[PDB]
Design an enzyme around this catalytic site. Sequence first.
Site, PDB file in Angstrom:
ATOM      1  N   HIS A 182       0.841  -1.189   0.000  1.00  0.00           N
ATOM      2  CA  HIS A 182       0.000   0.000   0.000  1.00  0.00           C
ATOM      3  C   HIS A 182       0.883   1.249   0.000  1.00  0.00           C
ATOM      4  O   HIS A 182       2.060   1.200   0.373  1.00  0.00           O
ATOM      5  CB  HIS A 182      -0.914   0.029   1.231  1.00  0.00           C
ATOM      6  CG  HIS A 182      -1.998  -1.004   1.197  1.00  0.00           C
ATOM      7  ND1 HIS A 182      -2.973  -1.026   0.223  1.00  0.00           N
ATOM      8  CD2 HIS A 182      -2.250  -2.062   2.008  1.00  0.00           C
ATOM      9  CE1 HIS A 182      -3.783  -2.049   0.437  1.00  0.00           C
ATOM     10  NE2 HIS A 182      -3.375  -2.685   1.520  1.00  0.00           N
ATOM     11  N   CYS A 225      -0.513   2.267  -4.414  1.00  0.00           N
ATOM     12  CA  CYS A 225      -1.332   3.437  -4.692  1.00  0.00           C
ATOM     13  C   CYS A 225      -0.572   4.717  -4.395  1.00  0.00           C
ATOM     14  O   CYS A 225       0.358   4.760  -3.589  1.00  0.00           O
ATOM     15  CB  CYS A 225      -2.647   3.450  -3.909  1.00  0.00           C
ATOM     16  SG  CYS A 225      -3.764   2.061  -4.178  1.00  0.00           S
TER      17      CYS A 225
END
Lengths: 237, 237, 5, 5
Positions: A182, A225
């Site tokens: 992430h 991301c």
Amino acid sequence: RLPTRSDMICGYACLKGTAAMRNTKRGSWYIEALAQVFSERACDMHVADMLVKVNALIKDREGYAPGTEFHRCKEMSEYCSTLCRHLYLFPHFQLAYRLQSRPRGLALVLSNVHFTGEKELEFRSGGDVDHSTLVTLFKLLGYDVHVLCDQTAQEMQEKLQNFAQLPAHRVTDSCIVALLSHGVEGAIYGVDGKLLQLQEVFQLFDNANCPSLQNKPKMFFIQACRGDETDRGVDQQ
Amino acid sequence: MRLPTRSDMICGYACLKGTAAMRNTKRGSWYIEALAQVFSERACDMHVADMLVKVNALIKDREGYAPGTEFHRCKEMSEYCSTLCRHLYLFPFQLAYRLQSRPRGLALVLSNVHFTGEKELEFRSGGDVDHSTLVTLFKLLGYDVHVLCDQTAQEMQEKLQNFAQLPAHRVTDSCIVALLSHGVEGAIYGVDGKLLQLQEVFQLFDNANCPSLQNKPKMFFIQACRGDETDRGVDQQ
Amino acid sequence: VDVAD
Amino acid sequence: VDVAD
């Protein structure tokens, strides 16, 4: 004399501010496309042109997730480059980086998939496929592959620096670092929900901090991301 | 088939995030001078991304001349980022963007050299050489060149939107925008000392706001500082 | 001489 | 299904 940073290429799964897409069974769109292109074309295409082919695959893909905001969503990958020659991996020699050592270089694959709860970061289903994809691909490309899994931000920083400082870099011709987690714009999460800034990662491999890799091509692939925006996409006129 | 919101762009930057871009008070900016030199010589057989690699190589080798100042023997590194999905040959065919229109596209050269703000931005000596160099280069490469000089931030936003919305883009095959000014990371200054965020510039030309340029290559060149750090360079080991 | 942008 | 990183 050299600038402080040069001879790097950095592939990003998505654009600043947006989410990178991952299939819960097949893995991330970007890593899947990356390995598909590299496996087929590393023999006759340099790395920057290979990443353009990756861009074309990502541009054409769209999300399948009925009942959620990701259904029919879009993503766009990019790469940024301070390379000063063609980067052929040679699994043309005169205008390309020298790339003949055995191994071709050391590679690090660092995958965070299981998170320890501190922040709301979810299990990255399919991350195992991404990890297997890059380990196998980089071995077949002739790299000596180091692996790390499910690391905190501090472990990431410390072990990335250890990797950058390895003596083996003196006798190789290139380097690969792949980070899969992430993240937010400009930083990636450890499993503890703490952030490692990407500028600090690149600095570990720059001409000041990593003289062993001066003038040698350094590849970074970032599967994370870069923000919260989901791209709904646009109709072709 | 639908599109991501942004694709088919390539953006060349005179320097790296956080660092200064260098300009010679008589010869103009290092980056523009190298860009014009490479593009003038190699556009007939090299695609744009590969030419920008040659520009990177020129910049990496240059060092500052500014006796008795902090810029003496300083260094700089240029870079480019790419969401291109095909080779970009300017053709001054099969695997490349279509690039056969007459003109090949519209080009905008926006140069700010005279500043009068509450920020302490100095007159950009040599910026006139950069401006005339790019106007000559893009005409030579077959573009219809539009020019703007010494614009405020708001003027730049409004007139960039007007340029992006011109009807001619429907039938041309590509677009070029060059922005030359003072800047900070991610934004450039107008002559009033107010900032225009580069993300809003790129948005004006994206697939949602500029449908006429969907799937057509869009080149951006940004001659502006991205920070205050002077690069003292590193001795090559 | 060289200066910063 | 597709989810976000």
